[PDB]
Design an enzyme around this catalytic site. Structure first.
Site, PDB file in Angstrom:
ATOM      1  N   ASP A 126       0.843  -1.195   0.000  1.00  0.00           N
ATOM      2  CA  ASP A 126       0.000   0.000   0.000  1.00  0.00           C
ATOM      3  C   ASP A 126       0.879   1.247   0.000  1.00  0.00           C
ATOM      4  O   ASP A 126       0.564   2.244  -0.648  1.00  0.00           O
ATOM      5  CB  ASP A 126      -0.896   0.003   1.231  1.00  0.00           C
ATOM      6  CG  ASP A 126      -1.742  -1.239   1.321  1.00  0.00           C
ATOM      7  OD1 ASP A 126      -2.618  -1.419   0.456  1.00  0.00           O
ATOM      8  OD2 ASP A 126      -1.516  -2.044   2.247  1.00  0.00           O
ATOM      9  N   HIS A 132      -4.331  -3.323   7.077  1.00  0.00           N
ATOM     10  CA  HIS A 132      -4.166  -3.630   5.664  1.00  0.00           C
ATOM     11  C   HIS A 132      -5.567  -3.997   5.187  1.00  0.00           C
ATOM     12  O   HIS A 132      -5.917  -5.173   5.103  1.00  0.00           O
ATOM     13  CB  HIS A 132      -3.228  -4.819   5.450  1.00  0.00           C
ATOM     14  CG  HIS A 132      -3.086  -5.215   4.011  1.00  0.00           C
ATOM     15  ND1 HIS A 132      -2.739  -4.317   3.024  1.00  0.00           N
ATOM     16  CD2 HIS A 132      -3.269  -6.404   3.390  1.00  0.00           C
ATOM     17  CE1 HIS A 132      -2.718  -4.934   1.855  1.00  0.00           C
ATOM     18  NE2 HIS A 132      -3.036  -6.200   2.050  1.00  0.00           N
TER      19      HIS A 132
END
Lengths: 327, 327
Positions: free
Chosen positions: A159, A187
């Protein structure tokens, strides 16, 4: 010459493992002067396929591959392990509910957590990649008596990298000129990519882009990125996920660059007010095998709000896990 | 640091491409100081998938990736290319004769050959990986008027590495202590792994292994290795083939180790009495982009016989393509 270190990788015959193993053996993760011994683990049903992967690894004639072992026994795979990449997780099936997924994953990571505590090096560094990453890491360290919980981490580096790529594209500058990117939290869809402290070639990010773009375009796009790749390729982002795993370990062991930091989900010790215990992504610097959360960052109302939301999602997941009596 | 180089790759959304692209962008093929511009090519029906691959490449935030372009047009993909990796080949369809497969590939490599000659750098280095590699390379350079035929090569490095691996396992020594391995001929079942000039830790290979093992175990095993991977993984050896392609270009562009050599299939100029024109694998040393066949080696009856058998196979192939008017 450096003495060989043992790297354990689970879910070794899977897609992420297939992109991951060859680059590690090539010395991209711990250095071109660091020989490695790969200890691969798979479930019984995948041992045949794993055998095929071992053959391809031999067929690369890697000078740094000092050893190669494949097994279906965690106590063998984690023996004297210096590093452990927990990639394999519960495969989602039909009729399988959220709680059902938690139970199966709960079983895997309690067992692996225990094996690590029993046969791996005391200072073994662990990275959980299998989803849900942050919670599986919680289950693992909670079931690894004797090991330091801070040695257990979860990956948010993908990410982190996706955010830098989007910012670079928007500002029309090389990704290598982007610094201090931060992805906070879980996440999942509640992850918070922080642009308040990021710099683009020396200048603060928010001086080159506006809040409208940040809130309406940037955040949703980074959050949807995994889905866009699946829609395009018809398969998940294995190679970019493998790359993120390597960078996560590499920066942790070799250290983060001067004046910069990276994102890592680690067991909270109350930094920025985040509840203790949960594995939460924080901005961190690392030096010689040890990392430290970067503190002192100013948190405005926009950020705190999002940081609270994702922290709450993690607390909720922990509640469920406790309910199932996994921790 | 250096000026960026343009690397063209066909069949970019395929399995080999998926294992290949990320390591090139990481700097493993031409060095950590050589920025690269990737120009990817796929057939129209796979462009959606290639777009997904492009996104994963962006999500790796590679500092050396100076440019990234995807297209279904050969003239666009090969424009000003410094290197061209021809991975994509004709897919094998049910009820498709040998002559039929030859025609499809013929169309492919005739067009790519013409495209390279029209828009690529005049000194462009070409590596053909798609099967049948040796013959596809012949068709390509024969249809690339204006380009040095010797800049067109076929990959036999995977068989080369497989042979090194088997010898290392048999002798119980590190694969890094194996030198002067040679694989002559076509990339097929008639390939010839030569142990007569190979050295294991400074000692001649045939001093640690006997001719029986060499003839009935070593040769058949290296020849069947691809099949073994397929039977074990249920898929072809994508990662090890990608590694081989990287090393092929790397040792050619940067140079081979002192006192050693590698295998490369290049257009024959009569070396060792091999028919000119056909792309045949020879032992070769390279330095700064230029390679030279290692001549003067003693060839015994055992080696000569096998060298002719594989040579004959290549002539038959050239015969058929010339019969189809491809060259």
């Amino acid at each position: 010459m450096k003495a060989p270190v043992r790297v354990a990788v689970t879910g070794a015959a899977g897609q992420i493992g297939y992109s991951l193993l060859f680059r590690i053996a090539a010395g991209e993760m711990l250095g071109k002067d660091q020989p490695v011994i790969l200890q691969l683990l798979e479930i019984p049903q995948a041992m045949k396929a794993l055998e095929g992967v071992v053959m391809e690894l031999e067929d690369c004639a890697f000078p740094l591959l000092a050893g190669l072992e494949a097994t279906d026994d965690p106590k063998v795979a984690f023996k004297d392990a210096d590093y452990a990449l927990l990639v394999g997780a519960a495969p989602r099936k039909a009729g399988m509910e959220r709680r059902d997924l938690l139970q199966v994953n709960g079983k895997i990571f309690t067992e692996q957590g225990r094996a690590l505590a029993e046969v791996a090096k005391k200072d073994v560094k662990v990275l959980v990649v299998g989803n849900p990453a942050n919670t599986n890491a919680l289950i693992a360290y909670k079931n690894a008596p004797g090991l330091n919980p801070r040695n257990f981490t979860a990956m948010t580096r993908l990410d982190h990298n996706r955010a830098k790529a989007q910012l670079a594209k928007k500002t029309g500058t090389g990704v290598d000129r982007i610094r201090r990117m931060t992805v906070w939290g879980n996440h999942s869809s509640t992850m918070f990519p922080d642009l308040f402290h990021a710099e683009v070639d020396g200048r603060p990010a928010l001086e080159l882009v506006d809040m409208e773009w940040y809130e309406k375009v940037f955040i949703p796009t980074v959050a949807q990125r995994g889905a866009a790749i699946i829609q395009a390729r018809g398969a998940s982002s294995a190679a970019s996920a493998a790359n993120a795993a390597i960078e996560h370990i590499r920066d942790w062991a070799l250290g983060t660059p001067e004046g910069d930091w990276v994102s890592m989900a680690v067991p909270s010790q109350g930094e920025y007010g985040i509840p203790e215990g949960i594995v939460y992504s924080f901005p961190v610097t690392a030096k010689d095998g040890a990392y430290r959360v970067v503190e002192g960052l100013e948190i405005n109302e926009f950020a705190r709000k999002r940081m609270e939301i994702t922290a709450q999602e993690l607390l909720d997941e922990m509640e469920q896990v406790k309910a199932l009596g996994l921790i």
